Enzyme design. Structure first.
Site, PDB file in Angstrom:
ATOM      1  N   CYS A 191       0.789  -1.231   0.000  1.00  0.00           N
ATOM      2  CA  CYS A 191       0.000   0.000   0.000  1.00  0.00           C
ATOM      3  C   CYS A 191       0.827   1.291   0.000  1.00  0.00           C
ATOM      4  CB  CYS A 191      -0.967   0.009   1.180  1.00  0.00           C
ATOM      5  SG  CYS A 191      -0.107   0.120   2.765  1.00  0.00           S
TER       6      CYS A 191
ATOM      7  N   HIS B  36      -3.119   1.491   6.980  1.00  0.00           N
ATOM      8  CA  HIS B  36      -3.235   1.486   5.507  1.00  0.00           C
ATOM      9  C   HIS B  36      -2.945   2.851   4.968  1.00  0.00           C
ATOM     10  CE1 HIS B  36      -4.487   0.069   1.578  1.00  0.00           C
ATOM     11  NE2 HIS B  36      -5.704   0.604   1.595  1.00  0.00           N
TER      12      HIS B  36
ATOM     13  N   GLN C 135      -5.545   2.408  -4.535  1.00  0.00           N
ATOM     14  CA  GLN C 135      -4.848   1.709  -3.435  1.00  0.00           C
ATOM     15  C   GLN C 135      -4.353   0.366  -3.916  1.00  0.00           C
ATOM     16  OE1 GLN C 135      -7.442   0.045  -0.324  1.00  0.00           O
ATOM     17  NE2 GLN C 135      -9.059  -0.445  -1.850  1.00  0.00           N
TER      18      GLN C 135
END
Length: 249
Positions: A77, A132, A152
């Protein structure tokens, strides 16, 4: 029809990443230099050098988990968000998304309401609750509403299932997301919201099939922090950077 063009730029970009030169130039962790100034031959030579340092390839695997360092990568990520951020925003002055200023105590709605209606922005999000990092793309749309898209990748392991950037972009890359839901997701209060609310916000914004049964809220770090940074971009420069990279170069 910036939306239609955006979709095509992202699609050709993703298809090119099966190419060695495109892949290495896209997914590299040097961020103080211009993305497009990356030399794929030199990168390849740097990997060769490193492997030699380690006493050859079969030895290199032994001491670093078994990874072939020449293989093409699909990025975690932070690496996908950091590099696509540079791809979108850079012209001729390098930008290091790891060093820009992040806002920690601003609501997302508050911040978006300060952005120029005629400018494109991309927001890079560092979400401690989720563990994240991801991007929110806010292109300016003529006589259209302020619209948001997600970019993403995720190797999985937290609240969200694993998703490759290529799959994400192919299924949901031009799927507008609610600024409303984003504002709720990104708030401090998110940590205290009911299970079903958290699960549905997450699935709706970040899961490739919008499937709440794919979300595990028990992996949330309810004390995790939320930070985010926004940055204008020129749409044609973005297209231009991506075309270059896709040029298998």
């Amino acid at each position: 029809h910036r939306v239609t063009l955006r979709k095509a730029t992202l699609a050709s970009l993703m298809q090119s990443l099966s190419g060695e030169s495109s892949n290495r130039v896209m997914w590299n962790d040097r961020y103080d230099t211009l993305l497009i100034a990356r030399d794929p031959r030199e990168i390849k030579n740097a990997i060769e050098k490193s492997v030699t340092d380690f006493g050859g390839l079969e030895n290199y695997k032994e001491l670093t988990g078994g990874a072939d360092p020449f293989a093409l990568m699909t990025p975690v990520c932070g690496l996908s968000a950091n590099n696509i951020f540079k791809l979108m925003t850079e012209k001729d002055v390098p930008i290091d998304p790891t060093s820009i200023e992040y806002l920690e105590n601003t609501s997302f709605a508050e911040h978006v309401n300060t952005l120029d209606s005629h400018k494109n922005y991309v927001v890079i999000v560092n979400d401690g609750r989720l563990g994240h990092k991801f991007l929110i793309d806010l292109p300016a749309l003529t006589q259209g509403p302020r619209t948001a898209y997600i970019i993403q990748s995720d190797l999985g392991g937290g609240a969200l299932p694993a998703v490759r950037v290529e799959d994400w972009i192919s299924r949901r890359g031009s799927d507008p997301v609610s600024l409303d839901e984003l504002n709720q997701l990104l708030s401090k209060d998110f940590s205290k919201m009911p299970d079903d609310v958290q699960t549905r916000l997450l699935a709706s914004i970040l899961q490739i099939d919008k499937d709440p049964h794919k979300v595990d809220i028990k992996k949330l770090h309810l004390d995790g922090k939320l930070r985010f940074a926004s940055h204008e971009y020129d749409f044609r420069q973005f297209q231009r950077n991506a075309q270059y990279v896709a040029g298998l170069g």
